Ligand SMILES: [U]
């Protein structure tokens with residue numbers, strides 16, 4: 001943290017943050033969500049980190065160079081250490097990125113290395129080459145060199161993600177899946193794990209071996225797993241929670257904006273809320289049905305009337321304000337809702353649905369006040385505008401993610417937040433073989449449009465190709481875009497160092513501080 005001149009700090013430097021739900025894991029190679037990455041950034045630090053405003057900045061690597069955007073060399077600071085005191089080395093990153101790539105690890109983010117195009121990744125994922133062939137090598141203890149199969153000008157932007165953070169080989173090998181217990185874990189970020197009580201709390205304590213430890217101010221942070229946004233707001237207002245999670249409840253938000261204006265932080269956020277359709281399950285493998293659902297949902301009612309927290313009605317998957325996005329707004333979005341509704345009823349009648357045999361399916365969502373109120377409003381809107389019946393089902397976060405990967409579903413509530421600020425951070429997730437593709441969408445046309453993007457060395461040509469990729473997705477109605485999020489949460493007046501300028505919301509508790517109050 002960089003504490004402004006003249007601010008007076010509290011004696012006690014502890015922080016309580018709500019984290020949305022129980023993390024899937026603390027293993028950087030087994031995680032894929034916001035809750036999971038919130039905690040991962042305090043414990044594991046990769047090559048680069050985001051600074052307080054979100055810019056890619058020195059992490060373990062103090063400086064780096066590239067040759068033709070294909071060979072990237074990272075110079076690792078000499079005093080980077082793990083919490084047990086041993087040095088963080090380039091060999092740590094070699095082993096880690098090989099473990100990420102290895103199909104035996106089954107990482108949900110194994111495709112992150114395809115997105116950066118590291119050499120040999122495709123064969124590695126397919127089991128044709130061992131993970132030791134991955135295009136990474138430690139030139140020495142403080143030098144990590146990455147070789148890509150094609151130029152990737154924005155490659156270094158990928159490197160703040162938890163999936164490319166280092167893991168400690170010796171703890172992993174000795175303890176297997178219990179390497180992350182508090183008695184066994186070893187960490188290299190600003191914090192260390194103190195306690196982990198499932199469905200109760202995660203407590204982190206300063207890591208004195210962290211290379212930037214002298215600038216760390218908060219000595220302890222607890223992460224809570226409260227999925228009820230109403231409860232999170234209540235425990236914030238009672239004094240227990242210093243920072244809510246960034247999902248706000250429909251029950252209380254309008255009241256909050258008028259009662260505590262200064263605590264309600266509302267900032268840009270590169271995340272899209274949508275209903276993910278399982279594209280390989282009938283009748284959702286029929287474009288007419290996916291299109292009807294997309295068109296009959298009334299975004300103005302949901303975004304401006306039922307939620308009304310600043311979100312913007314969505315017509316695409318990649319948010320239009322992503323760096324590099326120049327999207328074409330489709331004609332259906334400018335129509336009236338009436339005109340969308342006829343076309344949608346038309347398409348279902350054409351798909352063979354009638355009043356006597358209507359379209360009935362499940363709408364799965366992760367337990368949450370917000371998602372349940374949005375799902376009920378969407379069910380009612382779909383019933384009224386299209387005559388479809390929906391059976392709502394909630395599941396806890398971890399289970400919800402497994403279901404989506406299994407494909408044991410019809411439609412699911414969904415949100416994707418960028419990992420790096422470039423359109424391929426969204427678009428790559430719809431690639432046929434993407435480990436992140438829970439829409440189970442497979443389009444040879446979509447895949448080729450994206451493959452073409454690194455075969456041109458022109459930003460305009462690249463942006464036009466992303467725009468066409470979004471058009472292919474929309475044409476196929478892969479998903480139901482609902483709104484582009486705003487980052488809305490409550491933050492106590494004494495929590496300093498949260499700017500709201502990072503559109504990725506990559507917060508590091510080592511950058512925060514408690515003001516005397
Ligand atoms: U005190």
Ligand SMILES: [U]
Pocket residue numbers: 153
């Ligand atoms: U650039």
Ligand SMILES: [U]
Pocket residue numbers: 323
């Ligand atoms: U940029």
Ligand SMILES: [U]
Pocket residue numbers: 361362410
């Ligand atoms: U179903």
Ligand SMILES: [U]
Pocket residue numbers: 230251369
């Ligand atoms: U509620």
Ligand SMILES: [U]
Pocket residue numbers: 153459
């Ligand atoms: U460029």
Ligand SMILES: [U]
Pocket residue numbers: 517
């Ligand atoms: U106080």
Ligand SMILES: [U]
Pocket residue numbers: none
């Ligand atoms: U106090």
